Amino acid sequence: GLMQFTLPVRLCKEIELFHFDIGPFENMWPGIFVYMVHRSCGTSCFELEKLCRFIMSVKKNYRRVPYHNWKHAVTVAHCMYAILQNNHTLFTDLERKGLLIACLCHDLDHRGFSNSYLQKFDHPLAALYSTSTMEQHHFSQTVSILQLEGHNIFSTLSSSEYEQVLEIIRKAIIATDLALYFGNRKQLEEMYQTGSLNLNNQSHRDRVIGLMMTACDLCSVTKLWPVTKLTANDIYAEFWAEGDEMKKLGIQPIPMMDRDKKDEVPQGQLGFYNAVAIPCYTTLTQILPPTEPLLKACRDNLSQWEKVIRGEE
Ligand SMILES: Cc1nc2ccc(C#Cc3nc(-c4ccccc4)cn3C)nn2c1CO
Ligand SMILES: [Mg+2]
Ligand SMILES: [Zn+2]
Numbered sequence: 001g002l003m004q005f006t007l008p009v010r011l012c013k014e015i016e017l018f019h020f021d022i023g024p025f026e027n028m029w030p031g032i033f034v035y036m037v038h039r040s041c042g043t044s045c046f047e048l049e050k051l052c053r054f055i056m057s058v059k060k061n062y063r064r065v066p067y068h069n070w071k072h073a074v075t076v077a078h079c080m081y082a083i084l085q086n087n088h089t090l091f092t093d094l095e096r097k098g099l100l101i102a103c104l105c106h107d108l109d110h111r112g113f114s115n116s117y118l119q120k121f122d123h124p125l126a127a128l129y130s131t132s133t134m135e136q137h138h139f140s141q142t143v144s145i146l147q148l149e150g151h152n153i154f155s156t157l158s159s160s161e162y163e164q165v166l167e168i169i170r171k172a173i174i175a176t177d178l179a180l181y182f183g184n185r186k187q188l189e190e191m192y193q194t195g196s197l198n199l200n201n202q203s204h205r206d207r208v209i210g211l212m213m214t215a216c217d218l219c220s221v222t223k224l225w226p227v228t229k230l231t232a233n234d235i236y237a238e239f240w241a242e243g244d245e246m247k248k249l250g251i252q253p254i255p256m257m258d259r260d261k262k263d264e265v266p267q268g269q270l271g272f273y274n275a276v277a278i279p280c281y282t283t284l285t286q287i288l289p290p291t292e293p294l295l296k297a298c299r300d301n302l303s304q305w306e307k308v309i310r311g312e313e
Contacts, residue, residue: 003048005035018082018219018293021227022074029074030055033104036081041096046153054153057145058104065112066237077103079219079294083212086290090199098165099209101142101153102172103216108141110134112238113245115177120249132177139173168209175210176217178276184210185283192286208287215284215294221277222297225304236265266308273302 007015014020015032022032033055037045046054062070080103084096091099115133118126129136143166145151154162175184188207191197198204220231243257255261256268281295307313 004043005031005038007032007035015078016082016085018079018291019223019227019297020078020082021223022071022078026070029070030059033074033077033100036078037100040081040084040100041093045093045097047155050150050153050155054145054151055104057148057151058108061108061141061145063109063111065110066241067231067234068107068110068112068238073104073107076106076216076219079103079216079222080212083216083288083291087288090288094161094165095168095209097154098168099172099212101165102169102213105142105145105169106135106138106173106176106213106217108138108145110138113242115179117242117245120246120251132174132180135174135177138176139170142169142173171206172209172213175213178214178217180210181214181276181280185214185279188283188287192283197287211280211284211287214280215291218277218280219294221273221301222281222294223301225301228301228304232265232269236262266305269305270302270309273298273305278302 006012011023011032015035022029030052034048034051037051058073059070062068062073077100080099084091084099113121113134115126115131115135118133123133125137126133146154146166154165157165174180184207188197188211191204191207199208220235221228223231239257240259243253243259246253246257252258255264277298278295281291281298285292285295304313
């Protein structure tokens with residue numbers, strides 16, 4: 001009731017910045033997340049006991065894969081927190097409530113394999129969900145955990161507010177399917193530029209929350225260079241394991257997933273920053289000006305990858 005979560009001073013200050021790294025002490029990640037809910041949403045958004053129990057069941061349903069793990073979930077939530085704290089007044093109480101939960105849950109029970117490997121292996125999830133295979137799984141895992149006893153953090157919401165928040169969470173989690181990102185950012189580009197973009201148009205809000213989700217999900221490219229470079233090793237550890245699995249099915253993987261083509265990583269990251277990251281943070285900064293530090297950090301990391309290619313590191 002009178003119970004604030006507080007962090008040590010360096011964390012209390014640095015958590016407010018976009019480039020914050022949540023650190024290697026796993027047992028602090030739940031308290032970091034509660035801290036962000038309390039400041040973002042309020043000390044009364046959730047019953048603490050239900051929230052704590054929800055966080056620990058979410059944590060237990062992330063697997064120990066190199067990249068798509070519990071650390072990625074809390075990292076993507078921290079980026080969302082920074083966005084919401086720098087754009088206070090643009091977001092409903094339900095959106096604040098739902099989006100941090102969406103980020104924490106967005107990769108639930110990930111196995112370190114793409115939608116594309118599931119379809120080729122013919123995994124049961126690919127017959128249950130023909131598109132956004134893993135992302136429909138993540139949402140379904142979210143609803144499951146929410147329906148466990150004493151886990152309903154949304155218990156105090158009205159019936160219709162409940163249905164609204166679960167609909168925000170669903171669209172937020174679906175939007176993390178990067179295949180959907182390209183069309184969504186193109187449409188937001190055009191709507192912003194012709195001056196049609198309208199935040200009272202719910203279907204416009206949806207697209208903007210979609211773009212934030214892509215931004216939070218890729219936020220590893222906006223960290224300090226050593227964080228960005230070491231996270232890339234985890235990202236490629238998964239891609240190469242998937243490449244190995246492709247070869248086991250008799251399929252030559254794309255070069256991104258072929259550990260034999262390790263040497264071209266620098267050039268591959270460059271393509272990824274130019275094709276995906278830069279456009280994403282450009283359009284996001286256009287629509288939400290206080291998110292510009294994400295664009296600036298992304299550009300500093302692209303420059304670090306250029307430096308790697310030129311032999312300067
Ligand atoms: C947060 C985040 N999320 C992602 C997802 C993908 C990617 C990437 C990639 C890539 N690599 C190659 C490549 C590599 C070696 C040989 C040939 C091609 C091609 N592409 C597109 N990065 N990424 C980061 C930043 O690390
Ligand atoms: Mg995902
Ligand atoms: Zn993710």
